[PDB]
Design a protein around this ligand. Structure first.
Ligand SMILES: CC(=O)Nc1cc(Br)c[nH]c1=O
Length: 165
């Protein structure tokens, strides 16, 4: 199972880890992708997860969008986890660099409550432009299921743990 995580709360755990390497190691039931509404996995966590699937995640995602249309900001969809997980929960957090409402971050985290255990990144963090300290606070105050957070950057991981109230 998950190893080397620091326990933040009853149900939230955190580790300084590459979420692709973590997923390939654990092969969790659910890996969360930091998706956009179009499921265009170009960069950040989405680009890294997609590249690990040899683009199979993008091929599957384009078929999903062709059939269903784009997701909503704050929404999600369950697709295959390919070689990384049983399932991938593609969750759209608000992209602050697109003027999207930061209040949608709580709605985005609510998607995690439909899964008993998840491997996930901090939503809206990184290239999505939100404050990762704020994302972690919304995560612990919204998610009730067991969430194992992988934070890629060591310096950000240390800042998140040392400032966690
Ligand atoms: C290649 C790459 O984008 N690496 C990662 C970035 C972030 Br943010 C999270 N996890 C990663 O594995």
């Amino acid at each position: 199972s998950f190893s080397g995580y620091l326990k933040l709360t009853d149900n939230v755990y955190i580790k300084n880890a590459d979420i692709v390497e973590e997923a390939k190691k654990v092969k969790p039931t659910v890996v969360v992708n930091a998706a956009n509404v179009y499921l265009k996995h170009g960069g950040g966590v989405a680009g890294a997860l997609n590249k690990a699937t040899n683009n199979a995640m993008q091929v599957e995602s384009d078929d999903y969008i062709a059939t269903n249309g784009p997701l909503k900001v704050g929404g999600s969809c369950v697709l295959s986890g390919h070689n990384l997980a049983k399932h991938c929960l593609h969750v759209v957090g608000p992209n602050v660099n697109k003027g999207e409402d930061i209040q949608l971050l709580k709605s985005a985290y609510e998607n995690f409550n439909q899964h008993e255990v998840l491997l996930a990144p901090l939503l809206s963090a990184g290239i999505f432009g939100a404050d990762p300290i704020h994302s972690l606070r919304v995560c612990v105050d919204t998610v009730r299921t067991n969430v194992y957070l992988a934070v890629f950057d060591k310096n950000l991981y240390d800042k998140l743990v040392s400032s966690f109230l």
